[PDB]
Symmetry: C7
């Protein structure tokens, strides 16, 4: 049931995790809404098998035509549509996976050092190596390149998704039906068989609507991703550390005091 999907979701900067969780989670959700669960009914294609065709002859036409999709461009998309959404899902996850593997371990070690030293600064203020170290990160653009690349690849893939979905949704209405033919090889010569079988890719009607839903959300997601490039308003690694430091304020025992002190004073 759909609840077994929704509860699988209802029950690394925060906005970028949200962007990724949307960017990846939605198409995986939509695929699970599209090809799976009972709205899809029993089959993906069916065709006017003649009344003379046996139950398996008719099933042979339907299954042959499901291959014959690849032998026209919208039909090719309409068949592979779940995998194409999955491909976008994977391609949107990879920036976060690359971030996790290539950038997050350095940032983790740096932030943990920074936070502990800043708590020492507060302890000593009650009672500058870290500042010089931070002022050295001020003279660096290594980790921000990784971050920008992750945001930029996400932005590019989202645009490719929006382009693909806009094209797909616009073309879908014209082309959920096609004129298959089983007449090939030897049995091309079979006079008992119609020259072409009309077939409907029954799932295309679902994919059309859900492509629009995916397009709308990604069209909403583009400006949120674009906003990530406004880094100094949110271009040196220190600015990225500062943003992650502002994120990790939850851990700054000192800041929980010092911000209250500042806010009153």
């Amino acid at each position: 049931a759909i609840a077994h999907l929704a509860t699988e979701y209802v029950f690394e900067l925060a906005v970028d995790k949200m962007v990724t969780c949307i960017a990846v989670g939605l198409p995986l959700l939509l695929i699970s809404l599209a090809f799976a669960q009972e709205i899809s009914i029993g089959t993906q294609i069916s065709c006017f098998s003649p009344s003379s065709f046996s139950w398996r002859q008719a099933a042979f036409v339907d299954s042959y035509c499901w291959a014959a999709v690849q032998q026209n461009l919208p039909l090719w998309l309409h068949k592979f549509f779940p995998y194409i959404l999955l491909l976008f899902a994977i391609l949107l996850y990879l920036p976060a996976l690359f971030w996790r593997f290539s950038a997050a371990p350095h940032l983790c070690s740096d932030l943990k050092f920074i936070m502990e030293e800043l708590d020492k600064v507060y302890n000593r203020a009650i009672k500058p190596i870290v500042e010089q170290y931070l002022k050295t990160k001020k003279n660096s653009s290594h980790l921000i390149m990784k971050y920008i690349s992750c945001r930029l690849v996400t932005f590019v893939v989202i645009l490719l998704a929006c382009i693909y979905l806009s094209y797909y949704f616009s073309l879908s209405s014209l082309s959920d039906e096609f004129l298959c033919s089983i007449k090939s090889g030897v049995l091309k010569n079979d006079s008992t068989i119609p020259d072409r079988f009309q077939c409907k890719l029954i799932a295309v009607g679902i994919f059309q609507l859900l492509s629009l839903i995916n397009l709308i959300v990604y069209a909403l997601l583009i400006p949120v991703v674009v906003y990530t490039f406004f880094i100094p308003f949110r271009y040196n690694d220190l600015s990225l550390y500062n943003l992650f430091l502002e994120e990790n304020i939850s851990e700054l025992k000192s800041y929980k005091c010092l911000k209250v002190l500042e806010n009153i004073k």
Copy 2:
């Protein structure tokens, strides 16, 4: 079995969690009651395939017509009805997700500071920075804007749901049946085929009743949500903190003593 649904539910202010758990949990429940489990029987559409149609020709009509729904407005709704309830479920969860990600971390850090300092006030009373800090939150409307927006979006979405469900329920009875036709493309010319196939969206009868159930609960849920706007009776951030402080009284070791002392004295 339905118990596998009900036990999935039977076994952030409290009222707002209740509102959200109702607002989101019910449609997910109703979808799982509607399209899933054996009350739905074997298929979503079926049609008068002529007695001359083969078992798969008849299945082709049923499956073609399940696409032909989209080629009339009630039929379009009747097909997508599970996803539309799911859409409302997601749109009702998002206020709480936004609250969790955008408001709850600030509030958590603030409340934990406030509660500890108030326990210190009690300890010192046995044996004003926090008050000045609270009196500073008295001069703020930042977090209450987030809260009001969450309540307001929930209210708006619930009204959109109530409007949609009222419309759907009112129209449903007229329009669970429709006159499909497979006659398209080449086989539009097939003289052996009826010009139109009468079809019934068999699930619509379930969706009709369950839309009314969802409407009634949301009609009950509207005033509970509206009551959330009566904040000073329950418009400055301090009032929101006060309400969350009154919520977190479970944690106020001092209050468990001080309220007994007050209540006796």
Copy 3:
């Protein structure tokens, strides 16, 4: 298998938890016995499709008539019977959920204070604020209103269930069969189709027996619920706290000694 149901059950005052666990658990069990597992066999309706009808034409009649139930009152009940039992299950759980969310947190904080102070009284007896506090709860009717309302709503819903089940069981035997017709819209004019199809709601025979089982248990459950209103024999909040204190005697380290001392002395 039924063991996967029974073991899901075989493997907040106690009597009220028992009442709730019965009141909610039984219909969820009965639904899982009724519509689910192999006693239900393959389908919920079937009808005399003419011998001229195709396998899918016959399936179309059965599935159409499963919708046509709603187009007569017993048939409407007979279709929705699982959801109506589920509705009673939810409506019987809500008193306990309301109790858990609206009454139990106050009572928890109160009882934990009371129990600790009473252990101090025993410790001091070895070696009156709590009594004055309890004598203040003696002058209150706030929490007992919540309790009475929970018991009263449970009682009301159980009576509504007993009324519904008595009516349903009494009517069921007359009305598991009905005279469907697919003749509607265009194909109302189809001369090849019988004017009406006789159909049997095959599951009704199970629902009849299980409604009686549910009725009998709830008829047994009514006096147990009624007994809950005899509060001073078991009308001020202190009496409710006293009953919950008598419940929580398991926690009263002092009472485990003091009752032995009293019982000997």
Copy 4:
């Protein structure tokens, strides 16, 4: 597979837990052996649909007759047989559930006090309130009434099971077949339909054997339950506490020494 059943079992006095685990576990096992797993094959009824009947007309007869069971006493039993075994299973569990909820909490608190004081007696013997308390339980028949009632209800239900199973097994062989008729309402007049359909409740052959198995085990279980009434050989509450004390000897650190000392001396 049957191993998924058997391993669910293969992988409160002990004898009474054994009795209950048998009394409840066996019918739940037998039901899972009876109506479930592949020995049951595909269907519960089938009937001589005429060769003129369609595949769904024939399925309509089978499913109609599965309802027509209730419209003769052995047929009524033969249909509901799984639920009747389940009913016995629940009715045999309830004594233990009642024991767990109504008697075990008092007994737990009493035994834990008794055992600790008896360890103190041993500690003081190395280096009488509990005896006077026990001699007070010697003047009581409260908890033994609960115990006797649990044993007596179990005994009664087991006898009712043995009576039912003996009757069912004895009658089963005569009555796994019956002469259904679909001829009712309008289509009572259908000349194309046989006046009666012969049907076999195919599962009855399994239920017959398994009823005998259940009967034999319960016939073995009766004397074990009867033995529970020989309390003073195993009628005052102290005797019940003594038996539970003899059970809990596993916890008596002193007895592990004192019994060795006694056994040598």
Copy 5:
């Protein structure tokens, strides 16, 4: 897949646990190999329904004949064969369950006392109540009676299994086919129906081979069980305690030293 069976096994004296794990685990395995997984194909019986019989008439014959097995002895066995192996599995587990419930708690308490005192003897040897206690167990035959009975019942049941399996395997080849007839009651008179239907209990071919496998393993298991009776070579309870003490040498911290000391010295 078979791996989901094998990994359920691949991934109380040791030899007796091995014997029990074989004696019980193998038939449960074989049943899961026999009636379950795809080697069994789609059905347990099928019969020469005449070409005039409908698909459900033919299914009615097959399912009727699956009941008619019980209306000839090999057929009766061939149907119930899974439950008969399961019956042996349960009857082989019961000795170990009886051992666990009736003998192991005494033995556990005794061994734990014995082992601790023997470690004290070693500690005092570095720096006789237990010996007198053991020499008292030397004058006892209580627990060894329980053990012998467990081994003897296991031996008896294994022989009954070997007898049954030898008989079944020897007879199986003759009698996987039988001449059913549906001609009973009213439709005994149906001239359109053959006087008898030839049927094959298709699974019998699997049960034949697997009965031989079970027989061979149990024939191997008999002497291992018989070896258990050679107790003084492995008739007073001390000898049983000695064997369990030799088993629990893993726990004897002293023996890990003392045996090295002995082995060198």
Copy 6:
């Protein structure tokens, strides 16, 4: 999906655990690749039922012939092939199970003693009973007999597997088809039935390839097993302890120092 198989594996000396994990894991994998998952399609046998045979008559032939396999040697193998691979899997696991139960507990107790004493030797070297004990194990061949037997039985079973698989693979291509006949008993006389039905054991084509895969891996596994017999190059128990000591060097805190000291010095 195959990933649910592969991840079940992708996600006691080491080489012997590897050998066992291969020897047992591969056939269990191959069976799960062979008879299970969608490559196997819908059925194991099918046959030329005449066009006059009903759908169930044709299913009766297929299912009868699945039994008639046993009424020719390659057909007998081709049917039981999954169980024969499983039999090899179990027979290859038993050496490791026997090792775990019969040899590993002694070895565990010995190694743990040895390792602790060798750490004491290092501690005393910083600041010979174990050597004399080891020099006593030098005069023993008890545990190495168990080890050799485990390796030898594994080697024997692997050769029996390689022989069986080589034979099976070589014969498979000739004999995936056979000439069944249902003509037996009464209906041997049925003139409407062909004297023989040609059948194909459709799965044999998969078993052929996978038998070669199993053969190749086991042919690779033979020399690895043979290498295990080169014990003194890797015949007294000390040599086995030495090999297990070299294995457990991971635990030798001293060796982690002493080997560095040795390697530098």
Copy 7:
């Protein structure tokens, strides 16, 4: 649903773990995308059974031809394609498994020693055996041989995959159809049967696209694997330890300080 696949992945040097997780995870993913989930529809082959063939005769052709694939090279591949991808998956995992079992335990013990001694060097620097030991690893090529072999086998298998996939993808389009014949043995002579049946390996169209996807990723993966051979830019074991030391910098408490000190200074 595809989300149940993707979330199984979305939710030993790092680059080599990434390479392995890609190299192994992708084909397992693609197989689960290819042969499994609803895009594959109901069957792998179907064929032009004549209209005279029964539903099971037609199923017999389809299933016979699924065997007849092996009685032409592309057809043989097209059938076994899932197992061939799985074979590559296993063959790509084995380098990492061999690394885990044969190289990682030595490296683990070495690194843990090295890291602790380097922390001692820092502690002593606040307040050369390890250097001499490392300079001894400088004179070794044992572990780097294992590493190079793991990288080289991975590279070889990836090239074999790329070769296979390039060939398969290039040939696939020509050869998803083939001219089966059931005419063999006795029924070779059946005049009612066509001399050849045209069949389509319906899944080949999916395998074609997914082979290209696998090829593209592995073509991307080749240079990443090739880069692993540039060891001294990333040929003595010390260089491998240095790379693993640079990996384990996350553990070097000293380096977290010393690198900050170095970076500032």
